[PDB]
Amino acid sequence: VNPTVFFDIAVDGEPLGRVSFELFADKVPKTAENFRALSTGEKGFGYKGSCFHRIIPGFMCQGGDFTRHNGTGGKSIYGEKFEDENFILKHTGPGILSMANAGPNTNGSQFFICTAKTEWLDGKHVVFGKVKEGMNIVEAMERFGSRNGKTSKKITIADCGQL
Fold it and tell me: Which of 106, 108, 111, 143 falls between 20 and 30 A from 124, CA-CA?
């Protein structure tokens, strides 16, 4: 019953593979719905064509800034920001999908895919999904990151939607 969405990833425009995510709409419905709708584009804006602007191997892949492409932009389907819905779910290991923010109750569209256990983010970032298929594709993306987060090739969401 929880929705599944997919990203088709490209590296300098060459297809890499597909990642799918289960979104925990049963526990964080408002946060899950934002990501779902941005993945389908159904409200007229969303993730298709956007990049992963920050990738730190052994930590996380960050994306979702579809307005400024660098970590300073994005917006949710509810407005420019929305509240921290709850902190029921924790950052338990690789494959966790969590919201980026700039302080309490500042969620927009940016997110990150953890590639390690990040327990120091518990209670500060809302966890709302996990990788279901294609964790190997996330691992492949990670190799284009660097310690300061700048990517060596352009990592883009070439297509996305709901399965």
Answer: 143
**% helix, strand, coil for the chain, step of 5:** 15, 35, 55
CB atoms within 10 A of CB 147: 9
DSSP class per residue in 83-103: ------S---STTEEEE--SS
Name the structure determination technique: X-ray
Structure tokens at 151: 């990517």
Residues whose CB falls within 8 Å of the CB of residue 104, separated by 6 or more in sequence, listed in order: 84
Q: How do the domains of the chain map onto residue ranges?
A: 1-163
User: Is 1-163 CATH 2.60.120.10?
Assistant: no
Q: Are strands 54-56 and 14-23 parallel, antiparallel or unpaired?
A: unpaired
* Identity of the amino acid at 130: K
Nearest Cα neighbor of 81 from 45, 119, 42, 31 is 31
